[PDB]
Write a protein that binds this ligand. Sequence first.
Ligand SMILES: *[C@@H]1O[C@H](CO)[C@@H](O[C@@H]2O[C@H](CO)[C@@H](O[C@@H]3O[C@H](CO)[C@@H](O)[C@H](O)[C@@H]3O)[C@H](O)[C@H]2NC(C)=O)[C@H](O)[C@H]1NC(C)=O
Ligand SMILES: *[C@@H]1O[C@H](CO)[C@@H](O[C@@H]2O[C@H](CO)[C@@H](O)[C@H](O)[C@H]2NC(C)=O)[C@H](O)[C@H]1NC(C)=O
Lengths: 129, 639, 894
Amino acid sequence: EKVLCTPPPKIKNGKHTFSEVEVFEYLDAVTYSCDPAPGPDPFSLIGESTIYCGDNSVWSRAAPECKVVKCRFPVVENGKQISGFGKKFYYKATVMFECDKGFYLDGSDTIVCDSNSTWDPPVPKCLKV
Amino acid sequence: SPMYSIITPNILRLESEETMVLEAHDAQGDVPVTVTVHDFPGKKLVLSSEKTVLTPATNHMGNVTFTIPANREKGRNKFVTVQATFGTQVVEKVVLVSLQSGYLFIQTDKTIYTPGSTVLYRIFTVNHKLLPVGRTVMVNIENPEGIPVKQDSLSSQNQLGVLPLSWDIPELVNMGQWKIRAYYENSPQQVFSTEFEVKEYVLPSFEVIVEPTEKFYYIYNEKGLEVTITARFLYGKKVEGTAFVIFGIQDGEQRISLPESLKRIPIEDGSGEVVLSRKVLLDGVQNPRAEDLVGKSLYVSATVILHSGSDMVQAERSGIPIVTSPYQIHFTKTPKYFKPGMPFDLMVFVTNPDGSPAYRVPVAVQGEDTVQSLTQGDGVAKLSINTHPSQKPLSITVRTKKQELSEAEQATRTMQALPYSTVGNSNNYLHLSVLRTELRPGETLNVNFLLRMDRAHEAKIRYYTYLIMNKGRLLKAGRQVREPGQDLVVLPLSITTDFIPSFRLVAYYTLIGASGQREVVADSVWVDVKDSCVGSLVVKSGQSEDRQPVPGQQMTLKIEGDHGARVVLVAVDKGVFVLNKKNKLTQSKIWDVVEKADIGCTPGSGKDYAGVFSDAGLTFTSSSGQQTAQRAELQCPQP
Amino acid sequence: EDIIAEENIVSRSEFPESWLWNVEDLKEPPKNGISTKLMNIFLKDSITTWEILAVSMSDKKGICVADPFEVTVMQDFFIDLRLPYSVVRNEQVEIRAVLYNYRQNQELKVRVELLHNPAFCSLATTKRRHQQTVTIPPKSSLSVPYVIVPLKTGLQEVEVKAAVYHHFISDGVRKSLKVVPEGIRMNKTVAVRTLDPERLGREGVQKEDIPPADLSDQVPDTESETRILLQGTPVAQMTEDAVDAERLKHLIVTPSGCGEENMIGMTPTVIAVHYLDETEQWEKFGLEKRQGALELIKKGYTQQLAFRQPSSAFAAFVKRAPSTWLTAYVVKVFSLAVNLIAIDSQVLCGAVKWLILEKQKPDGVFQEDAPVIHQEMIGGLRNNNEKDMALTAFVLISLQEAKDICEEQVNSLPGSITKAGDFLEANYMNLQRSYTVAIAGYALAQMGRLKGPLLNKFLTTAKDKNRWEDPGKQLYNVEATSYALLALLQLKDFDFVPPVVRWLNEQRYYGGGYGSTQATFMVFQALAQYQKDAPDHQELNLDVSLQLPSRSSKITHRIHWESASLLRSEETKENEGFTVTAEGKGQGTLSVVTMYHAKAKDQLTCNKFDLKVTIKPAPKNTMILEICTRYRGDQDATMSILDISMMTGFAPDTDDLKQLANGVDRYISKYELDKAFSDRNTLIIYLDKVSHSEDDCLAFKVHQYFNVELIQPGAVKVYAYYNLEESCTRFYHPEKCRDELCRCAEENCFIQKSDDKVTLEERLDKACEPGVDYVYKTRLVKVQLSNDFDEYIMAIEQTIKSGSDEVQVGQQRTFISPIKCREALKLEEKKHYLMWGLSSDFWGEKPNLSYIIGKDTWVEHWPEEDECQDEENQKQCQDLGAFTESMVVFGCPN
Ligand SMILES: *[C@@H]1O[C@H](CO)[C@@H](O[C@@H]2O[C@H](CO)[C@@H](O[C@@H]3O[C@H](CO)[C@@H](O)[C@H](O)[C@@H]3O)[C@H](O)[C@H]2NC(C)=O)[C@H](O)[C@H]1NC(C)=O
Ligand SMILES: *[C@@H]1O[C@H](CO)[C@@H](O[C@@H]2O[C@H](CO)[C@@H](O)[C@H](O)[C@H]2NC(C)=O)[C@H](O)[C@H]1NC(C)=O
């Protein structure tokens, strides 16, 4: 008569709140986070961090992922960064560009770092006008 | 020569719809606009990005709406940079951020519980517009020492704003005031609370009401304090019995019982009368000077026992002010700035000593007895006065004029208003005139725009821009056209349910020199809107009379509300409230919470144009350099 | 019979304080947006007014709290049965059922009855049914007293019914009553232990053992609860204050000059903005000032490009040979500025590539071929004997800073870094200057190559463990200590950090001035990094398990800094010792507290009032009732209340009352003097005061108006108006225990048998029932008294049948019994007894096992040998002898 959930799934290099709980009620929620990493680059958390026990005795969402994501330094010839200044680019890092005078944009002015450490959309070019 | 401007709230909240008003004054053709919100000072995140176009069809006025996502404390203020690019020209402004994401309201089924019983409670999860939202919430139960004994994380997603919960109270437990404390997990620093009492009790069979003939005691009243005791069974019948009544004095947190005021009196047909004599009151204290009691309060304790000796009920009436006047005057609704030469509107708020609004009380400006008026249902009276075109401050003194009273018992109060400072002493002003009656949704408020400038430039002003702040956000923005010579224009403002419980109307115009420089001129007014629900909810009898009903009998309940709404219910024995009537949920308490969180700080006007914007809760920024000063303070400034 | 029967009356029993906890939706299409829901519900049995509160939540209208709707549920005839929150077992109390007649023009003749219940001694039994008939005037009420004695603890039940003659009118009320044991609710603190596995345990494991509670004074046959509380002890770590924003204003400067001086000016502004961003000080510094500072940084950068040579290296003048140090310093500054402004990668990575290809020697050393003109801008590198080590470290540090920016553009970078590392590694131990130990220490720590003896050299080179210093310019020591602090942060050696940061801040060096370039850049880089990396608190991850002997599986909890204040609780009904194990990081608290019912030494009733009630025949039946009360205080009692109930069929003299009502210190209601209708059975006398120096006494007469077999005792209750709980009750009835109510309450004292109806076969039959665990011949050594219990100390003279308790002949056992049972048992010291009972009678544990004399305990007086010689004792004495011989020789059958 009352919807219950078996504990949320465990994840590689991560953990979740209420890990000492075996029986979960209705609407009971849990938040994931990543472990500290051995290397110089920390783990990024991919997906929703918080899931709850809703209808059908299932968890609202699939458990997130904890892995190292690191895009390469984005370089735009005859252009400049106007946002996202930094040396390191992890998951969801966003960079905006703006072409120098006498130059126009060929591609998105805004790029984001993928879960496969690739810029999405690709790094734009600044073209001679 | 085109001037581009942006307007946003003074304080931006997380996960709440925010609007940014965009204007291109004196612009030709289409003006593309890109609006971006970044984190300050690193600009690591694109918090928002929206596009729009300013067209002659929209009179080069538009907006964008944006939302700031959940952040990432030490309590240090956070900031964002809001940025707008009109064609090539960038206008930017750093803005303060509030970490609040909405409200949580908590309802318990009862106010008091015995050990062994179960607390049934509900958490309502709404945003800043009081609309239901689905989010993750953390809930703590706390004992009377402030230690958490139970802790849960719950999602309210797909629950239409209602989180049903329970907690079992152990048989062995500490008595006293327990607490329920909840917070949105994205905004952990705003905790919402309610209390419930745990005690070993049995339900009373009747209720006792202790009420003084006046809601205060006048220190020169030789009749003393007269009190009426009323006893009545929970089922409606009057009580026969005996009452024990004793009085006391409150001085700060110090209570001083008056043993000599203890009287035993008959309760006949559910009524009794008892008096605290003036002599007893004065002999009960060491201070010879009677006037020293002024500022303190009296309390009354009444214990009624049935003739059968089967039940006993205690009730207390406290906070009865010892006063010299039945009234107090407040200027908390009046602007503290005026425009020299133009009418100044005084909102005088008169209250009874307990703090409730006084009704139909004559008030008058001292020195201009001609200028008088009568306070209304909300305790407000409006007094319009004519000002000289000098920089000399307005000192205003108001007195009450209740003819039933003596002069010594009239209330009095003084305030000061400073002149609004024009740009480069140009003597250019804007004045908003408005009606102040009980204002309700569905009606239309006529806003009067009265211009005051030099005839050499008056034709340049072809419109006013107006903005409506409500519940801490920009509700609506618009334009009011003006033809040359129209020194007064009217705006028919439609008051919808979105204006509850109040709003601010800021208006401004701008023009060029007149010595080549851009001048911005502003004014504002604050308007009260009659408290209710946005919709409606009523519970009554689906009968057909058949009252009074009988134990065990079926009855029909008529529930009239708004379509699609989810209604939650509870039935409580009145004896419970005879025991404890605190921490209950009402609509007025909700509106109170909302009004506390208001980001506007004054009743209106301002020191100058920037003051007018900021005091109303707004930023203003132009491409020509005119802008509001930085606000760094979540709270409104203090006296 | 002109009445409704007791079997045909359904008593009201539904009295929730709250109900109707329901969620409902408005789906009915509306009139002007207003939907109207009709719902059917069933009013509970309570006679009161309900407050129905509704709350709605709309997707577009939001939240709305409705006004309360009241529904009054009422009857014209009903019983009001009000019971205390709790009553004590074996204590005689008076409850009252008040009958209400709210009919305007109709008198009621009512028969009222209290149902029998084995949990209470009352005038109604299994076969005898206590019924009364009383007459209730219209628009009036009437109270019906019932004297009862609760027998067993827990949630029991009281039900009274009533009906009027000649009309179809009835009502019943069935309410539960809470019965509690004798004594006082006590708790004992058993254990309070500090949890800290790091410090208190072996190899990080802390086992804690907890003893049982004593409970020697526990009330027989009562429950106890052991409560086990766990909580965390959160500890904050202090972080040194940031350097105040105001101190950095002077560092916002305009960059000018050629290749070297432009960088001298660029340095303070870059690091100031960097420090202000990290410590979040812009609000206080002035938020709108940052943009101007960025522009100055941009200008510094742009101006520096004019001194970039075709090779990508830098020098003071374009015609001057490029400097290894200056080019490396530009990389250092630009790499940090990448977080602030758009830096051209190719400029930065070009400089890196040039350093590696042109200036790194085959042994890994970086070499300067053209020293800068401003020798004061290089800090402690100047005049440093250890030239190759210091410059290589300096350049290596710049390369590390650029590593992520230049990763894809300079393939020779990682091998260059490794090569430079090898040189520093192989020569580190031979270092003599603290400056070089510090800077090369940092360079190696960035690579994870500062270990063993090199790490030990780095740490022990510090003086007083707080600074790296050499003789010479003090600015060099500040710079060096800043490098060392950065190394410490790199190693995560946080326990060594606090003295170092304190020494730095104590120098009050705020940058700027001649030759201040390296000190200014390094001090604020180091202090910024410190604010970013220093932990705010000790880690708190405690794993705590407890094993109760009563259970099989570990109960495990984790304690966290996040929920450190959270009180984990575990409870057990057993009074058992147990173990607690703690593992992990941080500190916490374990507390063990057992709650129980303790036997009282002194009286728990009448603690504020003294009340003596007397009733004596007067010299048409008539007796005089005298009431004496004294307040137990330092002062006289204030206005107090005497609530008096008459014995059955009695009523007070009138002219006696009127004389009391005319009394100046007392008051009687005119109401209770305008009556004469058996409503005169209850009476309240109001007292202005109750003396505390002496007894206050009053007396009046009472007239019997009604004869009956079952005369219930009257009662007098005294209390002050402000405290109903501080009362005292005394019962009264005529004499010349006995009878009827005492008797019914004495029944469970022990097995009741009329002497000389007990046979030999009967004893053998009952003593041999399985369940009968012990059979003793005892001698009463001594009687011992408590407030609610007699304790009989028995010498065990013969173990006729032995059970769980291995008592030996000559040993003593204590038998406990309620004080009400004293006269029934009539035990006397020095006399002998035959006693047998169940295993349920055992109490406590060895060697403190005790016996409860209960309803199934046999207790028979065993005549002394001299009495047995009389013919009239022969049967009992001989039967006891034959009983004993049979039980010992052959035992119970089978
Ligand atoms: C374990 O036993 C001890 C002893 O009874 C309990 O300590 C006592 O707790 C009572 C109940 O809260 C306290 O009585 C109260 O005192 C305060 C003033 O301190 C007063 O405002 C109340 O009206 C009431 O009289 C009492 O202070 C306290 N005494 C001591 C010595 O600590 C303890 O509470 C018991 N533990 C549990 C879990 O119940
Ligand atoms: C922001 O601009 C939009 C579009 O102008 C406004 O949204 C509409 O406003 C019109 C009236 O001009 C209404 O008829 C529509 O119902 C609104 N639609 C939506 C999507 O809400 C919006 O009111 C503006 N916000 C302001 C002025 O603060």
